[PDB]
Structure 1
Amino acid sequence: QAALAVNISAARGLQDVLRTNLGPKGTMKMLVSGAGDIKLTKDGNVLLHEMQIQHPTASLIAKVATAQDDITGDGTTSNVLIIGELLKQADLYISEGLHPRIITEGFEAAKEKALQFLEEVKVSREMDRETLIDVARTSLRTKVHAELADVLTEAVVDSILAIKKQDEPIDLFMIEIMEMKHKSETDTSLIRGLVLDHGARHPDMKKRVEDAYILTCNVSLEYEKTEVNSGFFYKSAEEREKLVKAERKFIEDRVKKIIELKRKVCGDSDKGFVVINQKGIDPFSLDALSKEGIVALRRAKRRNMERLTLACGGVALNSFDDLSPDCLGHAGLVYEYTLGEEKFTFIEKCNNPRSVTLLIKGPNKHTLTQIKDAVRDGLRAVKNAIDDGCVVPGAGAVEVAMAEALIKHKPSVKGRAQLGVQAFADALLIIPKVLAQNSGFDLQETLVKIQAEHSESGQLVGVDLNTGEPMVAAEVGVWDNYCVKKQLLHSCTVIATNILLVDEIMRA
């Protein structure tokens, strides 16, 4: 019993650590590493990934909860909080001659009732612009400022509306994130296509390349000097001292190849042909290429190449010549853009534009990582919301609803499992009351008010987080994912099981 009590106490400690993070109006946590760089994060999954926790069972809880929550969006904060409360309620009887297994089967029966209850409690609503705005809000507000989240919603939802055309549960193949520092954070917008973090040494470019033919093969407009001729520093290094030079001709030869392909694909020197390089390219030849209607770019990173191939056609290769136009794509507008000091060239309106990207413009690193995490959370949450056909309102509404359902189900479950379903109901009650505590409205008063509102009317009613009054979460626009919350309840029951069964501490 001592080891079970110790495990429960440690889980309650980390539960108290995570208590204050849940809800938009909830105090933050920010980490510091050995190097001293800070990390602002109200997210739970990255938090448990990166926290240093003294306790052990806390370590296993964090590891397993994050591993199983990654599959189901982001819900691990509520998971840890509810399992901590459930462990509290379990201990409140384990101290009175309760054997873990009966409490576990009580939780299992409560889970069996609660999933089937949520089946008819989730509301079948058609996906549209407004509901996805609402779910994007309810996801983003849990990580960033309310006004800042409102700014994010448009981009984060419109990217998903763009990719929705595939009508299949496919994600992360596109909609990659793009980051840059800026003086004002408020600017943060989606970009159809992709964003290149570089440009080229092209003075007075025809920056508005609208007839942007694309073929993203690597052109060696700066040939890497052939220092290797006969090995390392033997007596034959006299060849290396001279063969390192005379690479100037290959730049112009490759440029002539690009000019030939430019002639082939456009029939003239007018329409802009855009090509890439993995390494640097000379400015002197770029001066002529900008006059020839040729746009070569340099210092490209790896995955962006095949991403352009998928979004706008073309192929990427290191060996280069006047390749046949067997894959020539065409971007509708390579929106060359620059603000601050660095050139970030946009690629948009690709021919049948597959990919999208989200340009987030956090002023500095500790805000940029926050905004990144917020965007990932919002995108994955709305992807889950479009994965299922129903979206269930949150804000502690369905939690009190299923808690009251389990209270009414108490006689239906036979035997000593009744305490199990009772403790499970209290664990579900922790959520609305912890939202009230985080907002500050005397959590228990808000809990009794919301339960009174639910009982008298039967309407699925949640807590209005900014005023404490019980409000219909569907009407307020607070929505939680059915898949996320389903796997949330699964994870809660499973890890609570695991923690009740453990009874011994082994030095091995």
Structure 2
Amino acid sequence: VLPENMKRYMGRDAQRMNILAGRIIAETVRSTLGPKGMDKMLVDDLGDVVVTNDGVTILREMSVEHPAAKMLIEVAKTQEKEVGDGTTTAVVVAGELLRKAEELLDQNVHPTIVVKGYQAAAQKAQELLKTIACEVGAQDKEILTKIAMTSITGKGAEKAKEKLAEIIVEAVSAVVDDEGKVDKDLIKIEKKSGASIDDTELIKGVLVDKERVSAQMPKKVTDAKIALLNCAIEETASEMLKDMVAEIKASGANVLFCQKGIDDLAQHYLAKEGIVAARRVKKSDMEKLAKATGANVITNIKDLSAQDLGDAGLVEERKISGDSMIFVEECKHPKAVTMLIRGTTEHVIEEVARAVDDAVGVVGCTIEDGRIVSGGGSTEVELSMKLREYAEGISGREQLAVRAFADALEVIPRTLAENAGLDAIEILVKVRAAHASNGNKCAGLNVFTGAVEDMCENGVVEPLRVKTQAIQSAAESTEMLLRIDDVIAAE
């Protein structure tokens, strides 16, 4: 009757295997979300040994056995590539969810009915998540720097947060054309040693990774006409390589970045005339230096010409913490802007590089939705006491659906209390009571002193595409995994 891999589990047998798998990797992930947790150390196979707190990776490495348990990576995985933030959230409440869906299924529910609850309480939840929404519109600066600070919390520096959420709002407020499309690609993040957390600056242009070629070429130009060649100023020795260099100084460059190198004796001519030049320079390089400086990007070094060519307000080669790089400031029309990040080690620079990228992301969310929620746990307790009262509206089995799915929304505000060594059942009361009466806004779980607070007036708050995706893609993922009743296993 079957063959090829076959040991077979319906009903109880089934329950066990899909609950244990999903419970598992929740426990995994429970104590990594927000201010109150904690670090994990992986090791595979290659005996290789790897500290991390962040949920995707964490289930990536760990070669899994449970196939059912494999379909749950899948649901943290599609929350990182998309939005980013909330890996954690989508998933954890995807295992909790399921525990609670066990108590029932042991009431012999018709798995039928329990889904007929958590669907109509997904849906309603949409109508809830949308109103607690405390609308503040798109380019208001106050709030931009409260969505940006929350882009920077639980992090190796949330400290900076006020200087990492400023030159960020200036750098996305400066990129986006026709209010309501929201571009990342544009904001590069360079990371150099020396400073503090607050000496991060926003050069209206492009800061690349580039020496001066020829030691010839003046180490700084004033009002410079930067060229872009993506393609060859290599030909083989004497003549060819002279005709390429005397045609750059024919058109109008002082400044040249070529994605395709330089020889010796051709930088000697470049520096003969007062032309500086930057070798090997990356095509990442190229496009940024194009919108910085103002450039239309060419093919070769042989089309290089002042007209497809830029305008730039200072251009020095600056050695910065024992490495040379090329700056390109005062930029006329930056689409797209680089933010210099001063910094600790490469590790706190990188992070203030990621505490902008996911800041520009998340504000490219308050362009397209200029909603703002709910200071982490906040909107949960609100959804709580609404959707409880929603339940007294359904009737039948779907009663017992929607009640359970509210009371498991208290999962996340709970653990972030517990992790915090707090009395849960006091605060819960504190926050719930203060949310029905203040609003969206006001109604928080602050870690610190331990009591309900204005994540708003702090503000401490996060974008709205974050909360939205994290809950939907999670919620419907764990009702798939709900619903397979029959496991015939095998490799």
**So what's the TM-score if we normalise by structure 1?**
0.83
Partner of 2:4: none
Q: Is 2:129 the counterpart of 1:118? A: yes
Partner of 2:398: 417
Maintained 8 Å contact 2:121/2:402: yes
The offset of 1:339, in angstroms, is: 1.3
The aligned runs of 1:359-398 (5 Å cut-off) are 359-360=340-341, 370=351, 372-398=353-379
Partner of 1:215: 227
Partner of 1:197: 209
Partner of 1:18: 29
The offset of 1:306, in angstroms, is: 3.3
Deviations 1:241-260 (A, max 9, x none): xxxxxx23333332222222
Distance 1:488 1:179 in 2: 30
The offset of 1:216, in angstroms, is: 0.7
The correspondence for 2:242, drawn from 240, 252, 260, is: 252
Distance 1:32 1:334 in 2: 47
The offset of 1:430, in angstroms, is: 0.9
The correspondence for 1:466, drawn from 429, 448, 460, is: 448
The aligned runs of 1:164-243 (5 Å cut-off) are 164-179=176-191, 182=193, 186=197, 188-203=200-215, 205-218=217-230, 220=232, 223=235
**SS of equivalent to 2:95:** helix
Q: 1:184 to 1:92 in 2, by over 3 A?
A: farther
Distance 1:28 1:330 in 2: 48
The offset of 1:55, in angstroms, is: 3.9
Partner of 2:258: 277
**SS of equivalent to 2:101:** helix
Deviations 1:165-224 (A, max 9, x none): 4423142341134455x366746444432222112234375444231212211575554x
Q: 1:36 to 1:154 in 2, by over 3 A?
A: farther
Between 1:279-288 and 1:463-472, the stretch displaced more is: 279-288
Distance 2:352 2:65 in 1: 29
The offset of 1:481, in angstroms, is: 2.2
The offset of 1:399, in angstroms, is: 0.4
Maintained 8 Å contact 2:217/2:274: no
Q: 1:140 to 1:283 in 2, by over 3 A?
A: same
AA in 2 matched with 1:60: M
AA in 1 matched with 2:176: K
Greater percentage in helix: 1
Distance 1:2 1:363 in 2: 54
AA in 2 matched with 1:156: I
Partner of 2:475: 493
**SS of equivalent to 1:138:** coil
The correspondence for 1:344, drawn from 298, 307, 325, is: 325
Deviations 1:99-127 (A, max 9, x none): 22211111112122221122322112133
AA in 2 matched with 1:496: T
The offset of 1:31, in angstroms, is: 4.9
The offset of 1:473, in angstroms, is: 2.3
Q: Is 2:331 the counterpart of 1:331? A: no
The offset of 1:27, in angstroms, is: 1.4
Deviations 1:118-157 (A, max 9, x none): 2322112133222121111112213433314444223333
Between 1:167-176 and 1:76-85, the stretch displaced more is: 167-176
**SS of equivalent to 1:478:** coil
Distance 2:326 2:233 in 1: 20
Q: 1:279 to 1:11 in 2, by over 3 A?
A: same
Q: Is 2:100 the counterpart of 1:98? A: no
Maintained 8 Å contact 2:14/2:485: yes
The offset of 1:80, in angstroms, is: 1.1
Between 1:416-425 and 1:327-336, the stretch displaced more is: 327-336
Q: Which runs of 5+ in 1 are unaligned?
A: 226-246, 263-271
Q: Is 2:163 the counterpart of 1:136? A: no
How many residues in Structure 1 have an aligned counterpart in Structure 2?
A: 475
The aligned runs of 1:472-491 (5 Å cut-off) are 472-491=454-473
AA in 1 matched with 2:471: L
The correspondence for 2:90, drawn from 79, 86, 106, is: 79
The aligned runs of 1:22-61 (5 Å cut-off) are 22-29=33-40, 31=42, 41-61=52-72
Greater percentage in strand: 1
Partner of 2:5: none
Between 1:17-26 and 1:331-340, the stretch displaced more is: 331-340
The correspondence for 2:386, drawn from 400, 405, 425, is: 405
Q: Which runs of 5+ in 2 are unaligned?
A: 1-11
**SS of equivalent to 2:228:** strand
Maintained 8 Å contact 1:42/1:143: no
Partner of 2:81: 70
- Cα RMSD (Å) of the superposition? 3.0
Distance 2:301 2:216 in 1: 29
Partner of 2:6: none
Deviations 1:23-70 (A, max 9, x none): 134213455676777665443344444554444333211123321553
Distance 1:221 1:303 in 2: 19
**So what's the TM-score if we normalise by structure 2?**
0.86
Q: Is 2:158 the counterpart of 1:146? A: yes
**SS of equivalent to 2:419:** helix
Distance 1:482 1:107 in 2: 22
Deviations 1:267-289 (A, max 9, x none): xxxxx621122344345654553
Partner of 2:16: 5
Maintained 8 Å contact 1:219/1:254: no
AA in 1 matched with 2:170: D
Deviations 1:430-472 (A, max 9, x none): 1211221233323344323323444576775111221210113
Maintained 8 Å contact 1:40/1:370: no
Distance 2:166 2:58 in 1: 27
Deviations 1:300-322 (A, max 9, x none): 1123223333441133322515x
